[PDB]
Design a protein around this nucleic acid. Structure first.
Length: 89
RNA sequence: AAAA
């Protein structure tokens, strides 16, 4: 239900944080802090996430599971080697 | 917003 919806949200966001996407996603990388973190509310605005939900708690819940990303407070980053990805704004 |  919401469980199915959470799975779609989780895999969509995991794609954004995949190496294959990051190698070409200059916008996302310019919005990273030096440690790789982005506001979860920024990710929430992306078209394919917004299509699935506008419920921020479901977005947080969907990412709690994830082995691809790490959450610290309101921010999210790729778990593996996040500091290699940020770019100048 | 060529899955920012």
């Amino acid at each position: 239900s919401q469980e199915l919806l959470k799975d779609y949200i989780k895999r969509q966001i995991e794609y954004y944080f995949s190496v294959d996407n990051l190698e070409r996603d200059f916008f996302l990388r310019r919005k990273m802090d030096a440690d790789g973190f982005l506001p979860i509310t920024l990710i929430a605005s992306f078209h394919r996430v917004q299509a699935l939900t506008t419920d921020i708690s479901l977005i947080f819940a969907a990412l709690k599971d994830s082995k691809v990303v790490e959450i610290v407070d309101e921010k999210v980053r790729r778990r593996e080697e996040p500091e290699k990805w940020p770019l100048p704004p």
